[PDB]
C-alpha cells in the first residue's frame, strides 16, 4: 500500500496534540452545529410548562432545578463556542438575572439561520451588517411597545401582582403565596429614596412540613445555641464585641515573673478581682445579652451566668456585621462597656426548636427594620434549593422593576410584534442586507414555537393565529396555557408583564454573541492537559 505524506510546512510543523481548521466546513459549520446541539438540550425547559433536569456533577451531588444558569454551569463543556455562550449567559445573569434560556434559543436560531445564509451564497460581512441593522431597529421600536407601568413600590397588593408572572414561570401551581411572601419581605426592608439592596434577604432552610407552613420573619436567625443558662429575655440590650470574651494579653511573646509567696498567692486573686470588676462594669451599663465572635472562657462564662447575662457566640464574620446593621449597633475591638450610643435596640430574644433544630430567633416588633429572613420549609433539599432560587429570582426581578418601572407585555406577543415590524421595515431596504433582516425577523418565532411545543399543542396554527390577531388590530394578545385548544388570549387582562430593560439587555447580549461568533473562521487549538 502507498502512504500519503504530509504537506511540507505548517502541516509538518503542526506538532502532536494540536489541531487545525482552516476551511469553513470544519470551523464555522462545526461551531454552528455545536451551538445548535447545545441549544436543543435546554429547549424543552423554557416556559412554565418546561420540565426539570436532574444534573449530577463529579462531586456526587444532586441538582434538580429548573433555571438554565445552574444547568449550564454544571455541564463542563469542552467547546469554545459553547464556552462563549455560557459566558454570555453568566454575564446576562449577573447584569439582570432573568434571561438565559431566551438568549440561548435566540443565539441558536440566529446561528442556524446564518448557516443557510452562508450556504446559499451570502458572505459574512453583509449578514453581520444586516443583523446589526435589525438589532438597532428592534431596539429603536422597543420603547414604543410599553403598555403598563408600576405605580407604587411599597404596596403589598401591587408588588405581589407584578412578580407573580415571573414566579409562575418557575413554580407552576403554588405561586401566589410565594409572591405575597416576597412582596411582604421586600416591603418590610424597603427604606426611602429608592436604593434597594440585594444582600438584605436571608434564606433559612428548615426541614419540616411543606410549602404551606412557610412564613416570613422581621429579623434574623442563627443555627446555634445559648452558651449560658439564660433562656429568653424580654427587654434586652445587645452588646456586640468583636474581640473574644477573655482577658487581653500581649501580642509579643512574654511570660509572667513571680517572686516568693506574696506574688504567687496574689496573682490569681488579682486576676479574679479584675475579671469580676470587668464583668460588673459590663453589666452595670444596662446590658443583658453579650454577643461575641471569638473563643470564650470558663471563668468569664460563669461570671456572666452569675449576673444573668446571655452569651451568643458565632463564627461567620459577615453574620456579625449583619446583626449589627439589623439592630443599629456597631462593633468594638476591645472589651469596653457602652454608655448610651452603643446600646441595643431589640425587641424579643428567645431560643426555640423547630424540626429538631435549635435556633436563636431575633424577632423584632417593628414592621420596618433593616434586613429580614424568609424561613422556608420542605421535606427534600432539592425542593428547598428550588424555592430559594425562585425567591432570589423574584428579588432580582423586584430590583430590576425598581430600577426601571417600564413594563411590557410578556408571553409571546412582543416578539411577534417586533418580528412583524422588522419584516415590514426590511421590505424597503435594497442591497443584500434585506435577506439578513428578513432572517433576523424570522429568528423571533423560535419563542412562540417553543412555548407551543412545551404546552402540548401545535405551533404553526398558534403562530398563524397570533399573526392574524396582530394584523387585525390587536397588540396585547398572546398565546394561552390553560386552554387545551390552540387559541389566543389577552395579555393585559390576565396580567402578563415582564421587564423591558432586562429583555433589552438580553437582546443586546445575544446580538453581541452572534456578531462575535460569526467573525471567526478558523480555530487554532492545542493538546489538553
Amino acid at each position: 500500500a502507498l502512504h500519503v505524506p504530509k504537506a511540507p510546512g505548517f502541516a509538518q510543523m503542526l506538532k502532536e496534540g494540536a489541531k487545525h481548521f482552516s476551511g469553513l466546513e470544519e470551523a464555522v459549520y462545526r461551531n454552528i452545529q455545536a451551538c445548535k446541539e447545545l441549544a436543543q438540550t435546554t429547549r424543552t425547559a423554557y416556559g412554565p410548562n418546561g420540565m426539570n433536569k436532574m444534573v449530577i456533577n463529579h462531586l456526587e451531588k444532586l441538582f434538580v432545578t429548573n433555571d438554565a444558569a445552574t444547568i449550564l454551569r454544571e455541564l463542563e463543556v469542552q467547546h469554545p463556542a459553547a464556552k462563549m455562550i455560557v459566558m454570555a449567559s453568566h454575564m446576562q445573569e449577573q447584569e439582570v438575572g432573568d434571561g438565559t434560556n431566551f438568549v440561548l434559543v435566540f443565539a441558536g436560531a440566529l446561528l442556524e439561520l446564518a448557516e443557510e445564509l452562508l450556504r446559499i451564497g451570502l458572505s459574512v460581512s453583509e449578514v453581520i451588517e444586516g443583523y446589526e441593522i435589525a438589532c438597532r431597529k428592534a431596539h429603536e421600536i422597543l420603547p414604543n411597545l410599553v403598555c403598563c407601568s408600576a405605580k407604587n413600590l411599597r404596596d403589598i397588593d401591587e408588588v405581589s401582582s407584578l412578580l407573580r408572572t415571573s414566579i409562575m414561570s418557575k413554580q407552576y401551581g403554588n405561586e401566589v403565596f410565594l409572591a405575597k411572601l416576597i412582596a411582604q419581605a421586600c416591603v418590610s426592608i424597603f427604606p426611602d429614596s429608592g436604593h434597594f439592596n440585594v444582600d438584605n434577604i436571608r434564606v433559612c432552610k428548615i426541614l419540616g412540613s411543606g410549602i404551606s407552613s412557610s412564613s416570613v420573619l422581621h429579623g434574623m436567625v442563627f443555627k446555634k445555641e445559648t452558651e449560658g443558662d439564660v433562656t429568653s429575655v424580654k427587654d434586652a440590650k445587645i452588646a456586640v464585641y468583636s474581640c473574644p470574651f477573655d482577658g487581653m494579653i500581649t501580642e509579643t511573646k512574654g511570660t509572667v515573673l513571680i517572686k516568693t509567696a506574696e506574688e504567687l498567692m496574689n496573682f490569681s486573686k488579682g486576676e479574679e478581682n479584675l475579671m469580676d470588676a470587668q464583668v460588673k462594669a459590663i453589666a452595670d451599663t444596662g446590658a443583658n445579652v453579650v454577643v461575641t465572635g471569638g473563643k470564650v472562657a470558663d471563668m468569664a462564662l460563669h461570671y456572666a451566668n452569675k449576673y444573668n447575662i446571655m452569651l451568643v457566640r458565632l463564627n461567620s464574620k459577615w453574620d456579625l456585621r449583619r446583626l449589627c446593621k439589623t439592630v443599629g449597633a456597631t462593633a468594638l475591638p476591645r472589651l469596653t462597656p457602652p454608655v448610651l450610643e452603643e446600646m441595643g435596640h431589640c425587641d424579643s430574644v428567645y431560643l426555640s426548636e423547630v424540626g429538631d433544630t435549635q435556633v436563636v430567633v431575633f424577632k423584632h416588633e417593628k414592621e420596618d427594620g433593616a434586613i429580614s429572613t424568609i424561613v422556608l420549609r420542605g421535606s427534600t433539599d432539592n425542593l428547598m434549593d428550588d424555592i430559594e432560587r425562585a425567591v432570589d429570582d423574584g428579588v432580582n426581578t423586584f430590583k430590576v422593576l425598581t430600577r426601571d418601572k417600564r413594563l411590557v407585555p410578556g408571553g409571546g406577543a412582543t416578539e411577534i410584534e417586533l418580528a412583524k415590524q422588522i419584516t415590514s421595515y426590511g421590505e424597503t431596504c435594497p442591497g443584500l442586507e434585506q435577506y439578513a433582516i428578513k432572517k433576523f425577523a424570522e429568528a423571533f418565532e423560535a419563542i412562540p414555537r417553543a412555548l407551543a411545543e412545551n404546552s402540548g399543542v401545535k405551533a404553526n396554527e398558534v403562530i398563524s393565529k397570533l399573526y392574524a390577531v396582530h394584523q387585525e388590530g390587536n397588540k396585547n394578545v398572546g398565546l394561552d396555557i390553560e386552554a387545551e385548544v390552540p387559541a389566543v388570549k389577552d395579555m393585559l387582562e390576565a396580567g402578563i408583564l415582564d421587564t423591558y430593560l432586562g429583555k433589552y439587555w438580553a437582546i443586546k447580549l445575544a446580538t453581541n454573541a452572534a456578531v462575535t461568533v460569526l467573525r471567526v473562521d478558523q480555530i487554532i487549538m492545542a493538546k489538553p492537559a
Binding site: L2, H3, V4, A11
Partner: protein, 527 residues
C-alpha cells in the same frame, strides 16, 4: 473524513505542494545522468548484488521510493523505454521543469485551466515546428554509424563505444531487408566472463549454450549438414494406462526389445538418411533437437560420427532456419535431403562447467549473434543494456525517413518559436506559453552544469548565436563554445522526441488537474 477517522486525505493546496515537492526531489536526483559527462551509480540490492548502470529507467526502479507520483513517473519512463528506447531521463527532467514552472505561476492567483490551455497551444506549436525542422537524408552507413556512436557515447568510454557501434551497425546491415520491417528476436545475446578488451565483435552465425553429451563424438567438424527437428527420442509412454504380462525371462527380453524397436527404427532411418546424404568420409552431419535424447540413441548415433544436441529453446530453431535456410520439420515422414542446412566450421568450446557450440561460416545468414564479454556481471549487464539501447536507436532511425540533430539547438529553436508566438495568443495564455518556453531550456542548462561551465551566460550566448544566424548551433561539451550540431555528427530521433513531448504534456495535464489525494481503503488487519 468524518465517516472514516482512520483515513488520511489531502486538500487542494496540500496535495499540490506534496506533488511539487516530489517532482522537485525526483528532478534533483536524475539531473546527473544527462550527457556523456554524467556520473555513474552503484546500486546494491538486499542480497548483495552490485549493478553498475547509467540508464534512468533502471535508476527510477532501483531507488526504493514509495510515492504515487514517483510510481507514475517510473511507469511512464518504463513505458517510454520499452516502446521507443532512450528517452527517460530527459523526459523526467522536462516533466519536473514544467511542473516547477506551473507551480511558480499557480501560487500567484491563477487557475490551472489557463495554464493547461496555454500548454496545449505550446505543444501544438512545438509539433508544428518539429514537423518542418526535421532533415531527411538517404540513411546510408555513415549516418547509422554516427547515430549509433552518438547513442553509445553516453554509456562507456571511447574504444568500447566504437566497437559496439560497429558491431550493431554490422548486425543491422546483416539483418537488413528491402520489403519486411526490422524484426527483432533474432540476434542472440550471449555473455562471457573473459577478455574484457577488444573482443565484443559480431559472430556471423549462432552460438548455443549447450554442447554434445557423448564423449566419443567429434569436437571440430568441418563441412557438415544442419538438421533442425523437435521430435521426441526418449521412452514415450502411451496415453492409456497399460502393462506387460510376460511368462518367463524370454518373454521379458522380447517385451524389452519391443519397446525399444520403436526408437531403433528411427535410429536406423536417421542412419540411412545420413548415409544417403554423405556416402564417403569428407563431410559430417549435425542434428539439432529441441527435446531430450536417451543415452541409447546417443550411443547408437556415436558409432557413425554424429554430433547431435538436445534440450534447446524455441527461438534457436527459428534463428537456425533464418540463418542456414533449412526446414524445421516435426516428424520423420517425408525426410527429404532438401530440408537440410549448410555449415562450414563447427567447434565445441568449453569454459569450465559450462559448454557452448559455435555455428559459423554459412552461405547467406540472416540471424547473427552478438558475443558479449565482460569481467564481472555488472559490466556485462551494462554492455548488454548499451547494446540494446543502440539497437533500439538504430531501429528507430531506420524506421523513420528523417533525422534530427541532437545537442540542445532544437530546444533553443522551440523556445524561440514559442517566444515569437507568445504575443499572438489571446487571453491569459501568454504566461503559460512563457512557462512552456522556459521549461524547454532545461536540457542546455543541465548540459552546461554537467560539462563544467556557466549556465546563464552560456544560454545567453547560445540564444544570441541562434538569433544572429538561422542555424542549428548546438552546445559544446568540451570548450563551451557555440558549435554546430549538424557539422560534428550529433543526431537524435524525431518520433522519440515527439513521444517524449506527448508524454510530458499528458503528465502535466494529469497533474495540474488533480488536487485531492484521499486514502479511504481497507486496512486488511484483523486481530
Amino acid at each position: 473524513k468524518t465517516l472514516n477517522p482512520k483515513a488520511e486525505v489531502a486538500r487542494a493546496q496540500a496535495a499540490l505542494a506534496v506533488n511539487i515537492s516530489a517532482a522537485r526531489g525526483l528532478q534533483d536526483v536524475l539531473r546527473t545522468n544527462l550527457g556523456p559527462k554524467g556520473t555513474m551509480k552503484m546500486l546494491v540490492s538486499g542480497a548483495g548484488d552490485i549493478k553498475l548502470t547509467k540508464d534512468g529507467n533502471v535508476l527510477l526502479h532501483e531507488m526504493q521510493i514509495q510515492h504515487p507520483t514517483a510510481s507514475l513517473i517510473a511507469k511512464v519512463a518504463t513505458a517510454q523505454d520499452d516502446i521507443t528506447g532512450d528517452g527517460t531521463t530527459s523526459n523526467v527532467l522536462i516533466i519536473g521543469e514544467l511542473l516547477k514552472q506551473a507551480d511558480l505561476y499557480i501560487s500567484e492567483g491563477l487557475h490551472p485551466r489557463i495554464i493547461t490551455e496555454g500548454f496545449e497551444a505550446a505543444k501544438e506549436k512545438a509539433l508544428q515546428f518539429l514537423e518542418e525542422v526535421k532533415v531527411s537524408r538517404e540513411m546510408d552507413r555513415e549516418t547509422l554509424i554516427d547515430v549509433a556512436r552518438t547513442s553509445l557515447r553516453t554509456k562507456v568510454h571511447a574504444e568500447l563505444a566504437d566497437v559496439l557501434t560497429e558491431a550493431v551497425v554490422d548486425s543491422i546491415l546483416a539483418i537488413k531487408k528491402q520489403d519486411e520491417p526490422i524484426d527483432l528476436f533474432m540476434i542472440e545475446i550471449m555473455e562471457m566472463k573473459h577478455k574484457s578488451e577488444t573482443d565484443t565483435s559480431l559472430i556471423r552465425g549462432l552460438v548455443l549454450d549447450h554442447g554434445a553429451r557423448h564423449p566419443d563424438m567429434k569436437k571440430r567438424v568441418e563441412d557438415a549438414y544442419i538438421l533442425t527437428c523437435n521430435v521426441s527420442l526418449e521412452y514415450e509412454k502411451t496415453e492409456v494406462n497399460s502393462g506387460f504380462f510376460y511368462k518367463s525371462a524370454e518373454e521379458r527380453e522380447k517385451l524389452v526389445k519391443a519397446e525399444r524397436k520403436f526408437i531403433e527404427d528411427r535410429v536406423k532411418k536417421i542412419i540411412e538418411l545420413k548415409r544417403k546424404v554423405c556416402g564417403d568420409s569428407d563431410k559430417g552431419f549435425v542434428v539439432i533437437n529441441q527435446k531430450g535424447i536417451d543415452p541409447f540413441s546417443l550411443d547408437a548415433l556415436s558409432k557413425e560420427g554424429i554430433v547431435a544436441l538436445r534440450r534447446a529453446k524455441r527461438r534457436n530453431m527459428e534463428r537456425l532456419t533464418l540463418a542456414c535456410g533449412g526446414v524445421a520439420l516435426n516428424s520423420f515422414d517425408d525426410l527429404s535431403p532438401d530440408c537440410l542446412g549448410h555449415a562450414g566450421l563447427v567447434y565445441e568450446y568449453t569454459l569450465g562447467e559450462e559448454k557452448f557450440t559455435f555455428i559459423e561460416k554459412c552461405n547467406n545468414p540472416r540471424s547473427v549473434t552478438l558475443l558479449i564479454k565482460g569481467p564481472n556481471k555488472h559490466t556485462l549487464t551494462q554492455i548488454k543494456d548499451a547494446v540494446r539501447d543502440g539497437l533500439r536507436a538504430v531501429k528507430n532511425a531506420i524506421d523513420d525517413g528523417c533525422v534530427v540533430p541532437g545537442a540542445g539547438a532544437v530546444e533553443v529553436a522551440m523556445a524561440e518559436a514559442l517566444i515569437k508566438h507568445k504575443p499572438s495568443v489571446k487571453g491569459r495564455a501568454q504566461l503559460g506559453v512563457q512557462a512552456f518556453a522556459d521549461a524547454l531550456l532545461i536540457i542546455p542548462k543541465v548540459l552546461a552544469q554537467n560539462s563544467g561551465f556557466d549556465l546563464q551566460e552560456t544560454l545567453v550566448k547560445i540564444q544570441a548565436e541562434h538569433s544572429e544566424s538561422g542555424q542549428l548551433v548546438g552546445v559544446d561539451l568540451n570548450t563551451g563554445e557555440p558549435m554546430v550540431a549538424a557539422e560534428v555528427g550529433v543526431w537524435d530521433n524525431y518520433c522519440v522526441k515527439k513521444q517524449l513531448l506527448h508524454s510530458c504534456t499528458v503528465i502535466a495535464t494529469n497533474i495540474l488537474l488533480v488536487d485531492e489525494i484521499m486514502r479511504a481503503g481497507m486496512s486488511s488487519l484483523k486481530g
